[model samples]
Target: YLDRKLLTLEDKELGSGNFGTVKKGYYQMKKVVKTVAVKILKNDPALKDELLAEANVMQQLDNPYIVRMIGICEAESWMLVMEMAELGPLNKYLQQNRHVKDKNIIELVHQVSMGMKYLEESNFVHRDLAARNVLLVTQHYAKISDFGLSKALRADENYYKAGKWPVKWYAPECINYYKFSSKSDVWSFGVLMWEAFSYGQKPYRGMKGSEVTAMLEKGERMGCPAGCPREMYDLMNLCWTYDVENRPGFAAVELRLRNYYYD
Candidate 1:
């Protein structure tokens, strides 16, 4: 619903995806104020559900570490107004500081896990949990965004038929079928840990998404990338286990991370 004329040709393109393009621009009259990041949802039937879902999730969440939704402009298309995080996504931050120390990495993971824990407690599962979806407000604090694919796992019958979601950082259950649960989020959290440790290495390297599905379906586990500590690697592997029931819940993950930090 953005007026194309409002955005100048020089407005910088922040990032983009199937959803829409995120642009960095300032309101002309409020130019002295801080800039804003605009997410223009694409006009596609395939993305309608996701766009609406993300809007709903943003409206519901009010955590400091979670991105704040300013407002939205909906017409034939949708434009999501969000607070600008000048540091950008976690992937870009990691790329700039690949050799980030263990303490800093742990701090980043702890903040992200805390945010995810909040979502899990609220019964929401972020289907696409990854570095690209995580934003850094500062070196110590991070926010989780891009909830377009999130699912609410309420005590209802309709939840099961929600269709299989993506598989990249998902657990075997989510990859094999659309069995999204709080546990599935834990699995994705494990992969998020791997991503944090590896400084945003692509998951299932040298393998296609289909191949990742095949391997996961056959009970073959994906290994953690280099630079991940032994104990952390084991934790991530446990998260990707074939049996979803065996995955540890966020409470357990939070405790383990707390211990890891204290030790």
Candidate 2:
């Protein structure tokens, strides 16, 4: 939990959604004041539980490549404290830096893959995964954010029913059967990589959700975005494999990406 008196907010809003607005703030810690992002929710008692639930979901994550929640504050409005992503969302950041190196883009994907590996190991499925949900700490460093639809899976029944999803980022199985799994997250990661490689272009620019689903169902994949490495596209194709069993897990994706970024 956070103390409202110890936190100071700036006038600038980082972003906002139905929950409310996010703003950058400073928290007076025991030793030093730390910069953080605050998710200030609208005044609605019904939303209190959801915010706490989201905080609980993020509580289990400890990877550098995933957003870290500091605590929740109960004041005039509920506030969720989180580590600051100074550069903000990756998609907008990429758009702001058109000349970003391909190597940096590849490195970003590698970092996110590491985060995904951690999530997979923890049995958490990010029902909504996309470039917009990825935040940048530095130009080349990335962190996975937005746990609004994340779920902890059981060994007995590992999948969940998808209600409303980011159609462009969803796997074929998700669109076809409304099923979600870590494998589906892998599919979304592929699309996220494409957005990074394309410098933040929408996954299916100008296309409707139905069109995307149709193309996916027909085994027609989106072509490689401009300047995307052929090898990277090959990996994205691997993620789009129709059969969940055929798609590479985050561990495999991380290994392949490690070879690209490190070796």
Which predicted model would earn the best lDDT? 2
lDDT of 1 by residue, 1-263 (tens): 34444443225677788777877755443345445677777547756666677878888887876887766666545677677777888877887887788778887787777887788788888878888789888887788888887877666632333543456887666655767777787888887887888787777888877888888777777575666678788777777777877778778887777788778
The lDDT per prediction is 0.74, 0.88
For model 2 the local lDDT of residue 180 reads: 87
Cα lDDT tens digits, model 2, 53-139, are: 678899887899999998988888789999898998899989989999989999999999999999999999997789899999988
Error of 1 at 238 (Å): 2.3
The C-alpha RMSD in Å for every predicted model, in order, reads 3.5, 1.4
* TM-score for candidate 2: 0.96
* Residue pairs of candidate 1 with colliding backbone atoms: none
Q: List the residue pairs that clash in candidate 2.
A: none
Given candidate 1, what's the lDDT at residue 160? 35
Output the lDDT of residue 210, model 2.
98
Candidate 1 has its poorest 10 consecutive residues by lDDT at 1-10
TM-score of every model versus the real structure: 0.84, 0.96
